[PDB]
């Protein structure tokens, strides 16, 4: 049927589970918009330069960094707060039941993240969907972020996975392009705060979805059509 | 004395220029601080992913996206207004104080900009201080965006330098990044919303500045000390 590879953070895990941190620190939680792309600007700026640490130690600077830049105090405490939420952030309600029908249907399940792997439980076994997927990989041991193509091709090549087998699944629209740029097929939820990007030359993504269910919709379908 | 090679938008133009757009459009003057390192981001993931379109085609592209993300109605108009204030932001009052100080201490100048070589007059010609810079550079020649190597290489090229003769002058620590990579100096001054990463293992500016007359008084220093 296919195998399709999940990124996690926004895609699976809420993101908002983060605000309250945000409200607290900023005294608004709107922050979380602006430190959030400058935490993926940053992750491609070290890959661009070949610099490279783990995706929590950029998460961390950055949020230090925008503080700075809103002249917001952080103690020791906030960073490990940061962290703390950044590892546990809950599974939105559609997506076990999305998963659920994508299994039942004979889809491969298989997650790819830029966070660095981290020790028993993960953030998808806290969250109570590790289960789902036959495989967890991540950009930690390519130490070059998304969407470089080192990290699609490496994930094909450990899957023993052709592109055309493989479907990239995201809430970001730099994910799902990364992939299809690396003739994987892409599909994008959604998710609150996240569009595509329109622009000539860029590809749309494959498989569109408001939410998990919708997208589930689509993929399901294509196996018929 | 060295040659010094200058970011444009928002380190030597006023980018809080562009604001009442935001304000208008959005209700709020902050969504600016999405939507530029949302331009950013993507003009990296285009360059990771092989795709090139000029900056100011992106800068629209992410100005719609980050409209639907907001809910917000966009309409031609607007999108008119985004390029006339985009290719239009005054100098920093600090700027040609500080270029006429450096030019009297024997450095030669030059601009360095992701934005497409544009139409005379440049936003510099308009700002009134393209005059003092003997070329202006951009990403067209290496159809990539900072801080990709190609983008330093080809212009130490061009220039017929050294890496060790340039300096890369930004308040985005991104771009210092990119320059001292490829062997140049880095230069930060720190504008309104921008301060340093401090992320180990990534390399900080040789120098700082509060603003630019205080950055080119420690380049001025860094001859006699």
Known sequence: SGILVFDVNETLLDLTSLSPLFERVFGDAK????????????????????????????????????????????????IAELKTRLTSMP???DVAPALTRLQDA?????????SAPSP???????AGIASFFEAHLT?????????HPSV???????LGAKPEELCMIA???????????????????????????????????????RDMGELADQLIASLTA
């Open 31 to 78: 922050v979380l918009r602006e430190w959030f792309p400058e935490l993926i600007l940053y992750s491609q700026t070290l890959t661009l330069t070949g610099l490279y640490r783990p995706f929590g130690e950029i998460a961390a600077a950055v949020f230090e960094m925008v503080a700075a830049n809103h002249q917001a105090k952080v103690t020791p405490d906030d």
């Open 91 to 93: 599974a939105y309600p």
């Open 106 to 114: 004979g889809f491969r399940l298989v997650t790819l993240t830029n």
């Open 120 to 126: 028993a439980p993960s953030p998808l076994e806290k």
């Open 139 to 147: 950009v930690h041991s390519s130490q070059r972020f998304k969407p």
């Open 152 to 158: 699609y091709d490496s994930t094909a090549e450990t």
């Open 171 to 209: 809430c970001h629209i730099w994910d799902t392009i990364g992939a299809q740029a690396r003739g994987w097929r892409g599909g994008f939820v959604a998710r609150p705060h996240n569009t595509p990007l329109t622009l000539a030359e860029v590809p749309q993504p494959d498989f569109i979805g």
